[PDB]
Amino acid sequence: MILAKVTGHVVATQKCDELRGSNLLLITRLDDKQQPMKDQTWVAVDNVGAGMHDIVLAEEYFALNYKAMSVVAIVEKVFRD
Amino acid sequence: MILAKVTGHVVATQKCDELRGSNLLLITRLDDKQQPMKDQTWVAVDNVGAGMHDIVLAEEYFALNYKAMSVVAIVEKVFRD
Amino acid sequence: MILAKVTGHVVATQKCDELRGSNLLLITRLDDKQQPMKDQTWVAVDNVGAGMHDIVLAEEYFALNYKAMSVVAIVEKVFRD
Amino acid sequence: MILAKVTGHVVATQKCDELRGSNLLLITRLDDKQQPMKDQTWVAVDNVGAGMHDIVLAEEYFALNYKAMSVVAIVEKVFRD
Amino acid sequence: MILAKVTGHVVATQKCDELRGSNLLLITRLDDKQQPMKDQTWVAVDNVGAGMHDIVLAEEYFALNYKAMSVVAIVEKVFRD
Amino acid sequence: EALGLIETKGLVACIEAADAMCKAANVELIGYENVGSGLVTAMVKGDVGAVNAAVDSGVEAAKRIGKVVSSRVIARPHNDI
Amino acid sequence: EALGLIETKGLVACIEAADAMCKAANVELIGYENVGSGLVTAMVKGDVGAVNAAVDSGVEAAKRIGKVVSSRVIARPHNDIEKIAG
Amino acid sequence: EALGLIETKGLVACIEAADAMCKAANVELIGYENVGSGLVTAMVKGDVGAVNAAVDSGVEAAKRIGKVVSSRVIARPHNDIEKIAG
Amino acid sequence: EALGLIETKGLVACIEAADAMCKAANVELIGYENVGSGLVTAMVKGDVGAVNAAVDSGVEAAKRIGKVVSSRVIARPHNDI
Amino acid sequence: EALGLIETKGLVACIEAADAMCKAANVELIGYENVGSGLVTAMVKGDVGAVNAAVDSGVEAAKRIGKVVSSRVIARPHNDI
Amino acid sequence: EALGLIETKGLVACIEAADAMCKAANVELIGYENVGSGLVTAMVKGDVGAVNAAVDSGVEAAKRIGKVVSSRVIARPHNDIEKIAG
Amino acid sequence: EALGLIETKGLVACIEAADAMCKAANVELIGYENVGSGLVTAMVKGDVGAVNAAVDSGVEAAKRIGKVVSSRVIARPHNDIEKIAG
Amino acid sequence: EALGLIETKGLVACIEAADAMCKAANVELIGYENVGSGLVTAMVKGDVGAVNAAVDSGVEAAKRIGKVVSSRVIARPHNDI
Amino acid sequence: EALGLIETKGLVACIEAADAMCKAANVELIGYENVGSGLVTAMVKGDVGAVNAAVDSGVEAAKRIGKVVSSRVIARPHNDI
Amino acid sequence: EALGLIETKGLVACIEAADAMCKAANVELIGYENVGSGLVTAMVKGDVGAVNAAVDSGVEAAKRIGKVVSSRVIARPHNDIEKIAG
C-alpha cells in the first residue's frame, strides 16, 4: 500500500465491463510531510467510499475489482517519528 | 490504472499467438497538466477502440489479453482540483 | 524483499475486511549506509511483531495477508562489504 | 510491453531447470527517439528468435517461460507522431 | 531478470516459515560497465549456491521460494556491444 | 440537463444511494420525495455522461444494503417536466 | 464528521435505539425523520470511531424489543448530504 | 463525435427507431442507407453519452414492431470513416 | 501495393470491420461495394505488412458483432486488377 | 478516554496480547489483574479509534497461542468506573 | 533484548525448566510469577538467538516430568511490557 | 532480409511451390538444394511480410500435387546462415 | 576448442537448428555435411561453456519443427579429429 | 562461541553441507572427522544466531543429494568440550 | 574454479571414473580420499563448463563396472572448502 490523497475524479463513458458501476478517483502520492508530490498520480477504483481531500491507502494490482488498483482504507491517524 | 495518451502504433509481424488480431498502441503517461512526459512510453494492446490523440486509461498486467497491458477505458472528463 | 526501517504506524478505522485485526506500519527504505531515504515510505501489514526503529525485511505483493505488502522478517545482522 | 533493443547476451551454466534450453538476451529500453537509455537493461528469455541490434517487444512477468520476462515480438515499423 | 552482484548477506532469526533453511544475500544491481550502482540493493533467497563477489541473475517475484525474489543463475560471460 | 432517479424501500438505503451518486461524478442533488408505502426517491441532475455514471454507482451501493426498486436516466427531459 | 443511521418499525424501538446510542459514545443526536409506513430513522453525528461504536450498541438495544430495518455508518458524507439530513 | 447505428429489416421499423432516437437524446440524424434485401440503417451523431442513450432507446422502440438486426456505437470514428457515412 | 478484403453480412458489421482496420495500421481505405443479398465488402490498400495486420484485426472485431463471410489479402495484385 | 479489556487463560497468553495491543496503536497500558482460576486480564486506555484497533489486534495474537475468554471496548466509561 | 516465557502446572516442573534454560544458553533469569491454580511462569532475558535456544531446551526438560502449558519468545518487547515483568 | 524455406519429396512438387511463391509476393528466388532421398528444398528471400505470404501460398500449391515435408520462415537470419544457403 | 553436433532429418530442420545455435552464444559455425538417407548434420566450435549452451538451444528449436536424431558435445576433441 | 554439527553418510554430502553452511552466515569451519561406517561430521563455530542459520541451511542442502543422519546446535558449550 | 566429486564403492570403480574424467575435458585431478567402508572419492578441478562435462562422463564410465554412490559439482566453492580438499 501507499499513503495518498484523493485529488479529483475521472468520468469515462466508453469502458470495459469489469469497471461498470464504480468510482474512478485521482490518487496522488504524498511525501513524508503529508504533502502531495509532483507527477505521482494514478487512477484508483474506489472501494470504501472516499471523497475529495481524504487521505486514503491505495493498494496495487490485485484487489478483486480482476486486478484493478483500488482504495482499501481511509486513514484516521498517521503517527510518524 | 494510469492516465495516458495514445501517441502512435507498432507494426509487428513475427510475434506470439496470444497477440494475433489486436492493436498495439504507444501509450505515453501524461502529467498533472494533461501533458505527456519524457521516457514514459509503453505498448498497450487496445481493447475498446482507441486511436491517435485520445486520452485513455491503461491498465497493468492482468486484463485477459494472459497478462498483456491493455487499454480499458476512453476518458471523457478529468475533473481535478 | 527490501531492507527497511519501521518509522511509524497508521490508524485506519473505515477499511476493508481483508485488513481487520492487523498492524499497519510505515516502512522507509534505507540506503547502503543503513540510513533512511527520502520519499520512500510504504504501508506494510506487520506479520511477525515489529515495532518502532526496527530494521525489517518488507516483502512485495503476495504474502497471504490476498496480496498485501507485509513484513516477513526482523533482521539481526547485515554483513555488507 | 516495452520497446527495447537487443544489445548482447548472457552465458550462464549453473542455473535452474525452468531455464534449460533458451536464450538470455540483454534488453535495453530505448527512448522516444529510438535510442537506448542509460541503466535500463534487463535479461529476457528469447522466444521468437531475435538477435543483436534488433528492436523487439519485451513483455513483463507472465509469458509461460512460469513467470520469466520474455521477448514476444520483433518490430517492423514504429509509427509515432 | 537483472544482472546483479552479491555484496553481502543477512542473518535473520525471527522470520516466517516459508523462508526456513535458505540463504539471504544482498544483491546490488550493476550498470553497463559491470559496476554496482547506488541505492539499488535487494535481498534475494539464494537458490543455486552463489557467494560473495559473484555476478548472478536475480529474478523477480515468482520463483517458488511462494513469491520470494531468488537467484536463478550464475553468470559466466556477459558479451555486450 | 439530464435527470437521474433511484427509488428505494426505506430512507437509509436512499442516503447511501445519494452519497454514492454525489461522489461518483459532478452532479447536483435535488432532493428526496417519499410517496408512501416506504418508497423514497432521490433525484440528481447534470450532464448526461455524469448522470449516467452516478446512477450506475448509486444503484450498486444501495443494492448492497437495501432494496432498490427502480432506477432511470432521462437524457433530454421535457420542459413541462 | 461521520454519520450514523438506524431505521426501525415504530417509534418505541427508535427511542430505545436513540437512548442507547447517546449513552454508549460521545455522539450528538440530530433528530428523527419518519417517512410513513411506521418507518422511523435516528441520525447521530460524531467522530468515526465514536459513531461506529454508537450504531453497534443502538442496534443491539433496539433489536431487543422491536425490529431494526437497517443500519449504516457514513465515514465522510458529501457536503450535499448535509442538507438533506439537517 | 460519436456514431450510432441501428439496422432493421424494412423501412417502417427504421422510421420508428429513428424517431425514438431523436426524441430521447440530443443527437443529429445523418440519414438512412439501405443495401437491398430489406436491410435499412439509420445513423445518428452526437456526444458519446447522448449517442449511447439514443441507441438504447431506438433499439427498444424498433424491436417492438419489427426486427432489429444489429446496433453499434463507435465512440471515436476514424476520419476515413467520415467519408463512407457522409 | 497490397490489397485486403473483408466481406460481411450487413452494413453495420462492415463499418466496425473498417474502423478496426483503419486504426490497426497505416492503410488507406478505398471504399465499400455491396453486391446484393446483404453482402458488403470493404477494401483497404497499403504495404503488405500493414495490410496483413489490418485484415486480421478487422476480421476479429466484425466477428464479434456480426457474421464475417470471407477475408483475403492479395500481396502482389495484377495490374489488370 | 476509552477502555479496552482482554481476558485470557494463563499469563503467557496475556503478555502476547498486551504486546500486540501496545504495538498496534498509541494506547497506554494500565496493568494486569488476575481474579483466580487462571483468568488474567489486561487493560489499556486511549482514544476510541486507537483502543478499537488495539483490542482487535491483541485478540488475534493471543488467540494464536492460547485461549481468549472475552474482550470488550468501552467507548465512554462512567466516572464511577 | 528478547524475552522468553514458559508456563507450567506446579513449581517442580518450573524449576526444572528454569534450570535447563540457564544451562543451555547465555541468558539471565528474571524470576518466577505465579497466578494461582498452580500455574507458574519463568521469564528469561537475553539476545534473540540465545533466548530462542533456551526456551526450546527448557520446554523439553520440563515436559519430561510435568506439564508445559505454553511457551513463547518475544524478539523485541515494547518498553511498556518491561514494567509488568520487572 | 527474411528467409523462407519449403521442403518437398521430388522435384515436381518443388517447381510448383517455387512458381506459386514467386507469383504471390515480391520475393527473390535463391535456388534449389537437394540432399538425396528425394528431398528438395526451395529458398526465397525478401521482406518479412512478403516472404510470410509467399510461403503460405507456396505450401498450398505444392501440397496439392505432392508432399510438403516442412516449411519455415526466418524473420532475420544470422549472418553466418547467409553462407550456407548462398 | 570444443565441438558440438546436431543431426536432423531433412535440411530445413537443420537450418532452424543452426540459427538457434548461432544466436545463443559466441560460436562459429563450421558447415553442414549430409551422409544420405535424409540425415544432415551441423557442426559448431567454440569454448565449452558457449558450445554447451548453443547445442541445448539448437536441439529444442529444431525439435519443435522437425525430428532431431542425435546431439553431442565433445569438450576436448583429439587432434587427429 | 556456539557450535554446530551435521552428520552425513558419505563425504560428498558433507562437502555440500559445509559449502552451504559457510555461505549462509559468518561462521568459521573447523574441520571434518569421520568415525567409520561411512559417517562424516562437519563442525562450525561462531555466534549463536549465525551458527543456527548455518546449520538449518546446511541440513537442507545436504538432504537434497544425500542422507543427513543428525544435526545439532550447542549454544553454550562447556569448556571441557 | 569449480569442483567436481564422484564417490564409489571400491577403488577400481574410482580409477575408471578418474581416468574418464581426465580424458573427457580439460580438468586437473586433485587426488583420492577414502573414508573407510570402501567409499573412495575423486576430486577434479577446473572451469565450470569443463568440470561439468567431466563429471558426466566420469559417472557414466564408473557406473558401468561398479557402483557410483553420489556425484556433485560445486560451481564456486568457498575459500574455507579449499582447505578440506587440499
Author numbering:
A (entry chain AI), B (entry chain HO), C (entry chain AM), D (entry chain DS), E (entry chain EM): 1 to 65, 69 to 84
F (entry chain AK), I (entry chain HQ), J (entry chain AO), M (entry chain DU), N (entry chain EO): 3 to 83
G (entry chain AP), H (entry chain AL), K (entry chain EP), L (entry chain HR), O (entry chain DV): 3 to 88
Q: Could you give the paper's own sentences about this structure?
A:
Bacterial microcompartments (BMCs) are organelle-like structures consisting of a large quasi-icosahedral or polyhedral protein shell up to 200–300 nm in size and an encapsulated enzymatic core. The glycyl-radical associated microcompartment group 2 (GRM2) type BMC locus encodes the glycyl-radical enzyme-associated microcompartment (GRM) subgroup that includes the choline utilizing locus C (CutC) choline lyase as its signature enzyme. The GRM2 locus therefore contains five structural shell genes encoding four BMC-H proteins and one BMC-P protein. In this study, we demonstrate a practical production system for recombinant GRM2 shell particles from Klebsiella pneumoniae and the requirements for recombinant shell formation.
We analyzed cmcABC′D + CutC336–1128 BDPs with cryo-EM. We calculated a near-atomic (3.3 Å) resolution map for the icosahedral particles and built an atomic model. The particles had a pT = 4 quasi-symmetry with 12 cmcD pentamers occupying the vertices of the icosahedron and 180 BMC-H monomers that were arranged in 30 hexamers within the facets. The map is not of sufficiently high resolution to distinguish between these three types of proteins, so we chose to model cmcC′ in the model, since the mass spectrometry data identified it as the most abundant BMC-H protein in cmcABC′ + D small type particles. The resulting pT = 4 BDP particles are 250 Å in diameter. In the pT = 4 BDP shell, there are three pores: one is in the center of the cmcC′ hexamer, the second is at the threefold axis between the cmcC′ hexamers, and the third is in the center of the cmcD pentamer. The pore in the center of the hexamer is approximately 7 Å in diameter as judged after subtraction of atomic Van der Waals diameters and contains typical GSG pore motifs on the rim. The pore in the center of the cmcD pentamer has a funnel shape and is approximately 16 Å wide on the outer surface but is only approximately 4 Å in diameter on the inner surface as judged by the Van der Waals diameters of atoms forming it. The narrowest part of the pentameric pore is very hydrophobic in nature, as it is lined by tyrosines and phenylalanines. Substrate and cofactor transport across the shell is probably mediated by the largest cmcC′ pore since the other two types of pores are too small or hydrophobic to be involved in this process, if it is assumed that the pores are mostly static in their conformations.
